[PDB]
């Protein structure tokens, strides 16, 4: 499910759904979300997260070969742990996205 991992710093960053969306409108909502997440990745900056921690996350993904809420929680804990141990006290993993693709994207606000 998850062969790739990306971490992006997105400081600025939830959708109030339309009430009686048709089938075509649901499809267009999914397409809109994909396109906007592409733009969000493109305009965001790479994380300070060093290569070794990236390899640790890659190993966590390769061990299960399938993403789940518990795995995303463990990845969040690892990333936040590195950030807080490095001196970025208000660093926070705010989301994971692009879950429909082979590449899990981790969103962090670094602060400090």
């Amino acid at each position: 499910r998850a062969d790739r991992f990306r971490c992006i710093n997105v400081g600025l960053m939830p959708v109030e759904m339309d009430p009686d969306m048709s089938e075509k409108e649901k499809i267009e909502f999914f397409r809109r979300q994909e396109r906007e997440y592409k733009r969000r990745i493109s305009s965001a900056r790479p994380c300070l997260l060093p290569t070794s921690v990236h390899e640790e996350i890659k190993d966590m993904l390769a061990e299960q070969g399938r993403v789940s809420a518990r795995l995303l929680q463990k990845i969040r804990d690892r990333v936040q742990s590195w950030y807080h141990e490095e001196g970025y006290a208000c660093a926070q993993v705010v989301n994971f996205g692009n879950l429909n693709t082979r590449e899990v994207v981790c969103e962090v606000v670094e602060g400090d």
Partner: antibody
Amino acid sequence: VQLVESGGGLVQPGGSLRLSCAASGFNFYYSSIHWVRQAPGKGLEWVASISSYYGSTSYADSVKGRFTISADTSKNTAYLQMNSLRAEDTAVYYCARETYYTEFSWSYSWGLDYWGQGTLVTVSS
Amino acid sequence: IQMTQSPSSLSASVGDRVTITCRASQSVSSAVAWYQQKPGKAPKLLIYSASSLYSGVPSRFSGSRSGTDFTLTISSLQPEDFATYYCQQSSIVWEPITFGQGTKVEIKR
């Protein structure tokens, strides 16, 4: 939009059975398929789900390891392979469609809106 | 995570207001759906996202959320409304779905 269950019947304990769910009328790559069962005189029990959009499968703990959910996306069909069947698995099995979006922080579901007519599985010697 | 419905069953007359509650147990959520099932038939979706009326469902059905407590209200109970009603939660990252135990609604006459 229609879902049709097939493959139910009578099977001995410890046996195996493969149920199929042919779902016509939508884009399989954007909706999850759920198997939900109802034993006689008991409530609805969610069994398993497969999302083609997120490429994921999920199982209830009561069937993990015995049941395998899968999908043939070209045929618009989902499958529930049931192995090591027990008397307590005797039930009406329905398949249902759920349009489902998720991130880590939030998600959205339009409900299990389309349901099949159900197929009875009887596990008895 | 558990979904605890209340009451287990109830009886009310044509025209009455019926209320069914459902508490999400051991987790917050936001995606709760309500279903109506006739005996031996496939359940029918009534409400999604805890407040949104599904296509074709009469407007006497309504839903509301107060934290982890969700409520299905039938405003003008009709004779064809006898059924078992279920709540259901859909959490993040395709986590397993859970149904409530169901509330059986009988018509008093």
